[PDB]
Design a protein. Structure first.
Lengths: 190, 189, 195, 194
């Protein structure tokens, strides 16, 4: 069991470019079970494939995008509107009005159960869940997090709590002074 | 596979001690059971040995639960609280009768998640849980799955979707804000 | 294992002389007042008077509430004893308690030194505090409300005023952490057994 | 029964063969070098990130004294950020790597043989007076800051300046320890039973 608050100031950047927040482990863009990242998309163009993986993307900032997946055009995607597609698909991204930054979850579906939900913390919100892995990404600054009643720290914009190997039902409570959007990503192995 | 359970069809069973009564919404020696209860008197809770419980007040002044000697903070509407069915538990009503919402489940058979959500216009999430119980506390919640409308819920109705496979995209909409409780269960294995 | 004892459940036994009463919090085992290895309790002392003996035992007493007391031990008068000032004396000593100004309540550890090693310390929990220890038995008494306890990073409960955590049979080095919103005094009692 | 007040001015200093830091040993029960002792207390200057040598068969407890802090990776598991006076225990048999979070730091270390010693370690903030009763046969009281006076069984035994340390061994029975200080001062009380 482990719990850490990952700081945006520590995220590495790789090649468009992507900032990886976390991964379960493994090497390269072919060796992980799951990976969470923030990407910068400055031009319309194709998305590289992640064969065998399931993808869920959300724009964070910018005018949005429209994704053509295997010839089929998605609806206009705006901030925090999660969209799921297969890494096996041929995807072209059309930027609606300029560069955007997005939030991406990529995972192997035959080995990891997943849940992804954007939530707006207004004062306080909470939930109970048995997920072994929780990634809680704060889009806006100022989200404090407690687990089983114990305060665990505060998140600044783009920081992300990462908890792994949790066992049993967990009670998570988020608090904030001003409305703050966060994305809760939960994963379970096999 | 996918049904919308209607409150008019829920059975009601009074408690042996006359302190309340329970309306069972759904159940899978059960693996899990979801119910609504009227609690009119303070008193102890019958045990559900080996089960995990999560209780939430739906209306009324609230309650305070004493679990194996530990007194909870005051519990008001939609403040979920978890405790073991093996624990000794006494419920003290804070200010009169209340109605609650309860999940009881076998932890060694099902993984579980429970969250109160206020649908303001629309909200959505993607999830892989095999079973979703979406309870509407208020009227007017429409639910779509994978972009396909699946119906609407009136106050206290509950969507029950079982045996779901793969990532699901759930969207809830309401013309006027409405509180719902999303309970997700999966058969671990 | 680990249990939090609640003050509302402590039994109360009036002293046969009517000068007070005792509420036993816990004991390792054994019967009566001469058969235990260690015993923790809270006593009410309503009048000045002699203290009954606990032959062969080491005692550590602390005032909890009230103006305080002065103990005359084998003829030597102690300095005035006020809240949370632990004082050790032998159960073999002749002891007279003089109440300074009215009734008091005290916290008492009585133990057999040939069977148990002991440590006792009043700690004021201001936000957070932690320590590592190998003691097999930990009794953590909260004088004031609001202390949350975690062991090895895991929350284990919360104590209201006069509640007491009792952990026995602990093996190896333990990491204990206490947290409180409003400052709260606690008394950490650690015991280890001969052998 | 012996009681000594060790002065920081008299501590030895051993530079690490790898050049990443140095260790100033405060006290030890016995032996020579990095083994043979039942216990050892020391302060260290950690100038750079890097692995920690092992101390096979020993239990370790480390606390940062000055600096931003560090994260310790123990057998692959990265600890939370460790800041001043936050003690952290780990095995001397473990593989450990230290990552400095913001520059060089000074730390305080306890290493002891678990098969032969019971141990307790607690950072205490002395403001005015504080006392406790204990039966430990050995007490090491390290003062991080100046101004702490110590009494045992009612008898004043000395005063500690920053980084000085009281070492008491062979103690018998229940002891009444009392620390007093005017301006707040952190001390770390280490108790070892034979």
């Amino acid at each position: 069991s482990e719990l850490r608050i990952l700081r945006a100031v520590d995220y590495p950047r790789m090649p468009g470019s992507t900032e990886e927040i976390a991964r379960d482990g493994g090497d390269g863009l072919d060796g992980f079970g799951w990976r969470l990242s923030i990407a910068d998309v400055g031009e319309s163009g194709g998305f590289s494939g992640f064969a065998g993986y399931q993808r869920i993307i959300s724009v964070l900032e910018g005018g949005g995008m429209r994704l053509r997946v295997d010839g089929a055009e998605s609806a206009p995607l705006r901030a925090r509107q999660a969209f799921a597609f297969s890494g096996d698909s041929e995807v072209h991204c059309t930027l609606l009005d300029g560069a955007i930054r997005d939030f991406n979850l990529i995972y192997a579906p035959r080995r990891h159960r997943a849940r992804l939900q954007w939530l707006r913390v207004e004062g306080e919100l909470d939930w109970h869940g048995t997920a072994s892995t929780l990634l809680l990404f704060a889009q806006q600054d100022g989200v404090a997090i407690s687990l089983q009643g114990q305060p665990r720290g505060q998140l600044a914009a783009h920081d992300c709590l990462c908890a792994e190997g949790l066992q049993g039902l967990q009670h998570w409570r988020l608090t904030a002074h001003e409305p703050a959007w966060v994305c809760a990503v939960e994963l379970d192995s096999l």
